[model samples]
Target: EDELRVRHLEEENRGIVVLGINRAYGKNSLSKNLIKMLSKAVDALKSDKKVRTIIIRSEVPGIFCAGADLKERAKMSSSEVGPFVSKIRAVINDIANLPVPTIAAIDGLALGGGLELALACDIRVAASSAKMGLVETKLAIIPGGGGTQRLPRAIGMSLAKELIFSARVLDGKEAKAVGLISHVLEQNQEGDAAYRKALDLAREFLPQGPVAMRVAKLAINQGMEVDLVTGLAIEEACYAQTIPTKDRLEGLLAFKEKRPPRYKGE
Candidate 1:
């Protein structure tokens, strides 16, 4: 039997991969085992060209993640601390670099490392009452999980600093208002309103060109971090990649026929 701490599931023929944080006993906090499983999950997804989108969500109803597993961290000796955190940071980077769009579905609490993990994703959706924060400052440490960098990039630097410094928690609506999250809905009876929202987002783009989708992600992610002149070249390269794809031919024919677009690649 597989350990369920991190569950990887795919929707048949949909190109949607879901990585469920399933450590319900500890509110889905990131433990060493969980981190390793997550790395493995992402590694497989990277090779899976069929995967056009990915969603990260909690299996448990009321909590996404409480942060690092403090009990596990406390038991780790000083010598192990640095390497363990580095692994988590690396795993987060892998998620961020995934070729497809990744959505974080937050239906419950997401704090410290949890919020950091969410930040790694390209999109975020949450229930209105879900709580999130980067509270490492209160624990006498700074965020070690790429949070300090991603947080500032996600929200304005001054606001991100204020939240980190104050250990301020935000509800989902507040998070959306501050641009920390893109969409917020009321928690549904099944506690997966945010997950549903993420699903719809994936569906909306499923009919589009798969090659174009991946290329566009690369263009935006790579271009935004560099100079305008260099960035334009990145865009040029990405744009050229989609020209020869069979999907483009299919798209043109479909448009001329006045019918729905059908994507064989996706």
Candidate 2:
């Protein structure tokens, strides 16, 4: 069963974990307790060696997240706002740096900080009716929780800038076209369409060696910010980590024997 604040669904048979954002405070906005609980959940996953992938989605329908809890924010002083937002940024970074691949399944409005949360994931899938945006500018404030940085890096700078500067909201198809989302479902099904698609994509990685997949994800994430030569070096270092693994030998032997490799993630 899903938790009241946050739900951890371990698809143990499939080696995937799904985190359902189920904020008790209406609309699923990021609150202090929600942030703390979510951080703990993710840390727990980090210690789980068997987990191959993570999927983030909201248990609440028609509203993935409305963004930060402005009502709570309104009561905060300027200094408090800074510290609070910084904590939010740290958690977002945690999601991005997780060793296993992470997917965001957005089936509803993911605006402001919500969009930034989705952007931190390795991949995103959206329901046909889902809408997304970095709309903080309309509130007279810019995106404070890594939105400006992650959004630009995800899509190109030009498109990201347009969406941020204009505070424009894009539907699932438009988001896919602009590279904001990896896939857009065709039908606007009522419940969990994006999450189901995310599960399907995660299964695609199940055949690969877990250690190799983790290393490859590290190489790509770290490589993007560096120069060509440095990135190549990073890739080599990452590859080196996987070379000595037993799964590597299993892959070679399986190929020689004409059989599918059974990777133990060694």
Candidate 3:
């Protein structure tokens, strides 16, 4: 019984897909339908050349996502949980690794796996009333959906540990202050705002050299996973390759001539 829905909005040059999980309340928040929809949406995105950007948003007003459905988890054996968490990891990882940037539009509660999912996106925008936590400890469990790895890396280790250990809920302002949310806005502004912001960002880069952008994103994402020396080595390699590209040459020449650069996506 999948309870998710996906809608596509076609704009001038890019496509936007929104996925909503329709579970109303409780710890079992993410409906099976939502995951199914997301899986299918991702498939389409992988093949659709028109979709240069994608924005993922949870159901309205009450909850962005509250993490694993406890009822679902309760029914899962340790063996089952292992694969389930792995699949969840794959989904979030795929979103993060998308060729185009992905944005997470979060509002309301985002606990445990839910918060981890948001962390997987390139950018996150949240409503001021949002609530977030790594509350797995409270359930006599720990996060299995990349929370332990990504959260500590995004936010400092101390803050990450504090939240995981305390299982305390953080409001949007505090979350923003601590770097959990990139942008904050008025309550009830997430639905439309999310799509607009993502498209605006897409438009900014859509005209640029797609190869350069793709390479930049790849390096940035992969660079973060290594030590400083190795990361710098990777950056240097990418830099060497990019400097000689037609796009870079054109960009430099245009800047010198004081004219807008016309990129050909070389």
Candidate 4:
């Protein structure tokens, strides 16, 4: 864990990577650093076969990420901040595109770009006090890092349009109500609970056939973006592709024997 520098924890075992980011208070500069760390972590996961899940947590006591450094941005010319924002956008986009499941464990506040980063993850688990929203319009900037593209998909276009237009923030309950987060944990329990949930969810995949897992993720992601006929065709092609694997035979045998199927991940 210490190997990751000021970012502290990075533990990988049985296909889960646990990461911590230390961005707290009114510190926008620190959030920038956190984004950079997350980008590096995302790249690292892509190259490491042992890692199939990534959980990003903030070490700041009651803060997840507070968005951009208003002070820093206020200091620089648009020329300076513009390119930096582009770089940040690229990082968050890469994090969203990671093949394996990713989770963001949140507490306190996640506003603007910070919340946008959380949106990039496949699942979000939040403490009871967690608050998230775009709030970028309030600052006179739209969410540059895929919020426009991603939020509507998660919460639907009507609600998303309201949030984007109003820049309204939502607390933990509100976030879940709109499907922005997967779960809202009980007080004092979310941190470790969310982390464990992420681990278990990833493990559920470990016993499944590996190629099936890969194709399932691909099909769901790609299929959803297209027409229904295309999506079904994708599933059909994937099922046909998997029929020859040893895992498929194991599945059939176990089903006939009325026993649990132990997949070979072939």
Best by the lDDT measure:
1
Q: Where does model 4 exceed 4 Å of error?
A: 1-13, 24-33, 189-193, 256-259
The full ranking of all candidates by TM-score, starting with the best, is 1, 2, 4, 3
For all predicted structures, in order, the TM-scores are 0.95, 0.94, 0.82, 0.83
lDDT of each: 0.87, 0.86, 0.73, 0.73
Candidate closer to the true structure by lDDT (higher is better), 1 or 4: 1
Which 10-residue span in candidate 3 carries the lowest summed lDDT? Answer: 188-197
Best by TM-score: 1
The residue-by-residue lDDT of candidate 4 on 1-266, one tens digit each, is 22223232233345566666654445323345555666777787777655556677666556777778777778878788878888778888887777767788876678877888888888898876777899888878898777898899989999999999999988888888888898887646435545455556656656666667766777888789889999999989877878889988998999999998876566
Candidate 1 C-alpha lDDT tens digits along 1-266 = 13333334445427777788877888888898888888888998888877778889888997988889999988999999899888998999999999988999999999988999999999999999999999999998889899999999989899999999999999999999999999999999999999889888877766678789999999999999999999999999998998888888888899899898888663
Candidate 4 residue 177 C-alpha distance from true site, Å? 1.4
Please give the distance, in angstroms, between residue 263's alpha carbon in candidate 3 and its true position after superposition.
3.9
Tens-digit lDDT track for model 3 on 23-48?
66554265455566666777777666
Off by over 4 Å in 3: 1-8, 12-17, 22-28, 31-33, 189-199, 240-264
Residue 173 miss distance in model 1 (angstroms) = 1.5
